[PDB]
Amino acid sequence: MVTIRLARHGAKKRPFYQVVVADSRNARNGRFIERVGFFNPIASEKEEGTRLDLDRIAHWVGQGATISDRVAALIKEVNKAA
Amino acid sequence: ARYLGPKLKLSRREGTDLFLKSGVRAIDTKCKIEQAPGQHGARKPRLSDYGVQLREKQKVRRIYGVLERQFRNYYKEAARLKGNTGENLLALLEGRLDNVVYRMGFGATRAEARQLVSHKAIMVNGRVVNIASYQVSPNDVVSIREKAKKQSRVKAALELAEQREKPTWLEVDAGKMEGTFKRKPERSDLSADINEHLIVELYSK
Amino acid sequence: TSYIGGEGHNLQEHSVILIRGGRVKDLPGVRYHTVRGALDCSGVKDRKQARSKYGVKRPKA
Amino acid sequence: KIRTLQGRVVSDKMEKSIVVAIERFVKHPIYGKFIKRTTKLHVHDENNECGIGDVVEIRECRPLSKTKSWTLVRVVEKAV
Amino acid sequence: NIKSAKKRAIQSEKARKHNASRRSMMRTFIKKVYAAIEAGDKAAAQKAFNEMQPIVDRQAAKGLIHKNKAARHKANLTAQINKLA
RNA sequence: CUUACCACUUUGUGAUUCAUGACUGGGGUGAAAACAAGGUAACCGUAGGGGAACCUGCGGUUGG
RNA sequence: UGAAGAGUUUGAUCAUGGCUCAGAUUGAACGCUGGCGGCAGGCCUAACACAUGCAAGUCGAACGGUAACAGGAAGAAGCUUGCUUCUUUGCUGACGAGUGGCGGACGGGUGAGUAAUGUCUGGGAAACUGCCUGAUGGAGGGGGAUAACUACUGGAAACGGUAGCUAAUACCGCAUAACGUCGCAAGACCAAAGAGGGGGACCUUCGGGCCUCUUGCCAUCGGAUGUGCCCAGAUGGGAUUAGCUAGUAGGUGGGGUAACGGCUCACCUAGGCGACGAUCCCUAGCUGGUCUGAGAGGAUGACCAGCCACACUGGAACUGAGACACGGUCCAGACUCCUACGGGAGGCAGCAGUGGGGAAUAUUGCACAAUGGGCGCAAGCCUGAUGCAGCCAUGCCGCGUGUAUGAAGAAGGCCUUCGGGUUGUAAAGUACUUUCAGCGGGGAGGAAGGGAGUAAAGUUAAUACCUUUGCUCAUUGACGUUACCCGCAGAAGAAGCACCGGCUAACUCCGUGCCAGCAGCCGCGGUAAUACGGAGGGUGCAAGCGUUAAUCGGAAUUACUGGGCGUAAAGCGCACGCAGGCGGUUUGUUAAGUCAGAUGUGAAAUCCCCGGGCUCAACCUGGGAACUGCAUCUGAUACUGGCAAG
């Protein structure tokens, strides 16, 4: 099943996340279908902690892709900031 | 690791004066310049093609106080940049925070400059930087922290600094002790006799 | 066939040693070089230059 | 009309099927010479409409047997 | 070793027993249709087919066999019956 | 219960290696004068004699 | 943005030609030395054998239940005014065992096998696809069981057997039935399961019915995802492997499969593959990539990502959407373990760890706080994935180990032509500083969330319940005494290793005497010997430095780019000749090569450019470029090919 989840990249204790459309059976940051944005948690004044490009998320949800809770929280934040 | 040996014997092997023993006493009255620094100092120093490339590379390193691993990396980055590699390399060497603190007067020798930088007593754009190889860019503001503006050594270094030529490419204030890196110095205003082509030939094989 | 280099010796008729490459301009067939200080071999005695090549440890001075 | 490889019959002795060799002129990867490479290829003709030396078009289809996945399209040169 | 494996093994034995019973019965009926075809009879074979058919369709309903297999048995057997005509 | 297939298994027959074996094969070890003019150019193939390496026959070459 | 050479054959020369050296690299190892941090990496060997723990569960909102815990309702008591003691009650929260569902096919390991249907690139047609999603419709009515349980009950045990009992979202009919399957058609045939919350009114056999919402169930058709299958090209070496093949190759029918198919069978035909390398032997996981190189190439495939294959060895299936199943089954081996000698049990190529091999590779750690995954409405539970921590200079990167001045130019050492020189501003002493380590104190960020209370007539018994948003409150960090900041003394705690004849930067004295030794090569050593050992000095590099191994380079030394064959190695003794390679000239045509444009694809990472964040750097990251290829379409037609005509 297709879920939009975070793939943990970055360095140790400096997490960076790729927002990736994936088949849910793959490893967290293994085989994926598509990258749809990124999330940088440790960026406070540091600029652009989150880019999502929500047209593709819309397209994939319209096909029965579930969201992880963290990506859903990130989508609320991006929409509110707009 | 720095180099912690005798400063003048390093200059005497290079022949020319290296500004790494600086102040009032005007070496060759400090101690016996112009004999290579050992038991066979008087022996003739005539040396090969690879010896002169080596000698100048060694001299540039001894001036700035950079070791061979970083100097090799400097050369790699300079040879990656666009433009001639030799002035790329001298500019990378002169954009070093160690050096910039020295050249802005406050800091007697580049080792005293480094003593200051390392000891949490310099601010680049209003925050403490204690890396000597930190690169200063055009329009940083290097300044002594307030806690160290009362230091007697920086004040003393300032006077014996306008006797030294003041670089054009950077502008400093001594009252409010603070400076400004204006632009990357060109090869021309780097007042020196460095023959950077033998250096680039050294690592080019 | 191995060469026991260095200025002295302690090897015997069964001792267990470590060998490394490098031949000697000796009679044909010598291309290995015993490592001094590695196993049953010992660093040569009263050696004070190129010490690390003979397994002799730094004199306390 | 999908790909229509265009070749020449080399054996007509299996019933309802021919063997068709395709010449390609490829450049040698290291030496840069243009060499000739052959691809023999079991094809299906239902009507035994082909004879050795004929020049034939084939297209790719579903596998008709072990090593038979091409079918005859036309005979372009019924060479005798 | 694992407890869900332990349960899943005896569940497979029970499922396997049920499945063997059901697909043997399905094969009994299919082979009765056949047995009628090589006897050369059209009425006997049509009766056999029409009692085979609900069995194969219900067993493909519950997943014992695939629908494709059900469509296969029915297609084959009607072809045989109709050439038998 | 009984067919069909089959892994393994046993047998035979084969191929293929592994070791070792007398031997090999004796490598030995120990024991019973002339530098192209110069004790008879420099070679090539081949055949002989003998512990051989040499010499000789037959053809050939100049790289005498 | 890109390319260096030197030494050694001679009495000397110039060629040839090998050897050797200077570079970069590494999953390294070893020897000597070793401060701090950051970030990474760490069994390459025995797919050797494995003690111990852990790595896969979960769901009471499917079910009988209720062992166990805690509650309620009691009862009988002690009698505190009912304070606590026994029995009963699933009445309840909950929940061991059991049934059922879903998960256990993922995630994690390894690289044995595999030389090509494995992989890569590019196409294809004949398939299926749990969960997710869209649409449409259905969801009626019965039955018989059975685990648990009870009582026996064998067995050392593992594991059972007998009799009775019992539910369901278990199972089985029946109905119902296209948009489904079979059928040319008529027709025929095919399905399901509830549970939960709340409730006005009404009814109630007082169980509930009824209402409403939520979720699940069945069918069909799509999506998405995943998987199966086909084709072409490519992807080692060996010809001191030249023939190979009877489901062999094809064809018709059966059968089988989700699907096509020699997949299988019966018959028929007698083919198929092979010198453009079949077959056989050997070696090998493949790719993105990595290293090296100016490049072309070579060498590789550790980490990370993708694909394959394996799970003690060999068979086989079952169950299931998916397996021919790492922590599933059985049967055959081989081992190990148990045994009451009847018979049993097991599989670290999960994490850690042990033995063993080895030159060589780490903890039997913490946590689910984060990101994922399984189950669950959820709360949550599980998760050796993962996040971290430990260890190790293994690499990379950063920073320390002080700074300024200081000539008695000190002692001391070493060389002295005995004048001195050198170590050497070096030290000392004077001032100065306090990074980092130490001590104290503050103190981010990784935390989003979830829990409880708060409107929309949301939805409708309208208030319910539930949903979204509404705020409000309290709460969630393994790392962790975090990063970081501040104070505190005090230079205080913090340099080594190689080399010094030439290549190759850097030399003197002593000793030794072709010994001892050195050595990469040249070579050195028989009284000096700048070459061996010590010293003093110097050079290089520096928390490292050397050595060994190994790969590319240098090597144009397999030469495509980019070499040669008179005598240096090298023209077959000589022809003829098939395959093959190559092919005078002019038209025409085609458009295969070729060229051009387009399009699609060329995973992400990596590499490169411009930026951004970490105090800098390494590292991380954004965008781009690149991926030099493959295919398809359109066009060109000089040249090569084809075809035609000369």
Author numbering:
A (entry chain P): 1 to 82
B (entry chain D): 1 to 205
C (entry chain L): 63 to 123
D (entry chain Q): 3 to 82
E (entry chain T): 2 to 86
What does the primary publication say about this deposited structure?
Moreover, the head in the map for class E tilts backward relative to the body compared to class F. The head domain is well resolved in the map for class F, and only the densities for proteins S3, S7, and S13 are weak and the density for S10 is fragmented. In addition to the appearance of the head domain, the density for helix 44 of the 3′ minor domain (nts 1407–1494) is ordered and well-resolved in the maps for these two classes, although the map lacks the clear density for the flanking 1398–1406 and 1495–1498 16S RNA regions. However, the reconstruction revealed significant distortion of the overall structure of the 3′ minor domain, including helix 44. In particular, the upper segment of helix 44, which is responsible for tRNA binding, is displaced outward and protrudes from the interface side of the 30S subunit that is in contact with the 50S subunit. Density for protein S2 is clearly determined only in the map for ΔrbfA pre-30S particles of class F. This is in good agreement with previous cryo-EM studies on the immature 30S ΔyjeQ subunits where the map for the structure with helix 44 close to its native position showed S2 density similar to that in the mature structure. These data are consistent with the interpretation we propose that the most developed 30S particles of class F represent an immature pre-30S subunit that is rather close to the mature state. Our data show that the top part of helix 44 is displaced and protrudes from the interface side of the 30S subunit, blocking the final formation of the decoding center and joining of the 50S subunit. The presence of almost mature intermediates (class F) with displaced helix 44 confirms this assumption.
Ribosome biogenesis is a highly coordinated and complex process that requires numerous assembly factors that ensure prompt and flawless maturation of ribosomal subunits. Here, we report cryo-EM structures of 30S assembly intermediates accumulated in an rbfA null Escherichia coli strain. Cryo-EM analysis of ΔrbfA 30S particles revealing the accumulation of two predominant classes of early and late intermediates allowed us to suggest that RbfA participates in two stages of 30S subunit assembly and is more deeply involved in the maturation process than previously thought.
